[PDB]
Amino acid sequence: GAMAPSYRVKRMDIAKNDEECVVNAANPRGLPGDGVCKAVYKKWPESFKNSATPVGTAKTVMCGTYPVIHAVGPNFSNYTESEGDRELAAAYREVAKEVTRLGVNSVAIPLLSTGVYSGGKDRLTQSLNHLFTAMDSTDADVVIYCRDKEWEKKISEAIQMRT
Numbered sequence: 001g002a003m004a005p006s007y008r009v010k011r012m013d014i015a016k017n018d019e020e021c022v023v024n025a026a027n028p029r030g031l032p033g034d035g036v037c038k039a040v041y042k043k044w045p046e047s048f049k050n051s052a053t054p055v056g057t058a059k060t061v062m063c064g065t066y067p068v069i070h071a072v073g074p075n076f077s078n079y080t081e082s083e084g085d086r087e088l089a090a091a092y093r094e095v096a097k098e099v100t101r102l103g104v105n106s107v108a109i110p111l112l113s114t115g116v117y118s119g120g121k122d123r124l125t126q127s128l129n130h131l132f133t134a135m136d137s138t139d140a141d142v143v144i145y146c147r148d149k150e151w152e153k154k155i156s157e158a159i160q161m162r163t
């Protein structure tokens, strides 16, 4: 584990992370996709061998020795608010289990069920709170990667608020 487990946020490409493993904002089918998923495919294409996994789950595939944890958040276009919220919480709980199993001291993580899986709603607070609920009991350093200036500030404030 990290000596003093922390949360940090950066606004940059998660494919250029400085952590011991990465979480992909994957689709259920292991397709290259667009956005974060496509950046992850371009950087670690070998990690998309049998990466397909259902909504609300996480499936780790090695690229060399670098673990890619494919986490499938619900697409709120398709899910009800109630069912989508349940599946989004579940995906993050599966990420925490994989991060623990891998024995890593750090993980790069994007906010799941945002952007094209958001159903046209700002889900920063909903997604980040489910991330915290799952990761708080882990001792990995967590580095959250985002792609929005207003989000970077809010995530940073939310981290600093808990101390």
Ligand SMILES: COc1ccc(C(=O)NCC(N)=O)cc1
Binding pocket: 011, 012, 013, 014, 039, 146, 147, 148, 149
């Ligand atoms: C390729 O990774 C990234 C990483 C971050 C961004 C981003 O912050 N866009 C919004 C802005 N430029 O205000 C875009 C792409």
Ligand SMILES: COc1ccc(C(=O)NCC(N)=O)cc1
Binding pocket: 114, 115, 116, 118, 120, 121, 122, 123, 146, 147, 148, 151
């Ligand atoms: C009002 O609807 C939305 C819908 C989606 C977003 C969103 O996820 N932004 C961050 C990103 N990285 O794409 C923000 C607002």
Ligand SMILES: [Cl-]
Binding pocket: 025, 111, 112, 113, 114, 115, 116, 117, 118
């Ligand atoms: Cl997404």
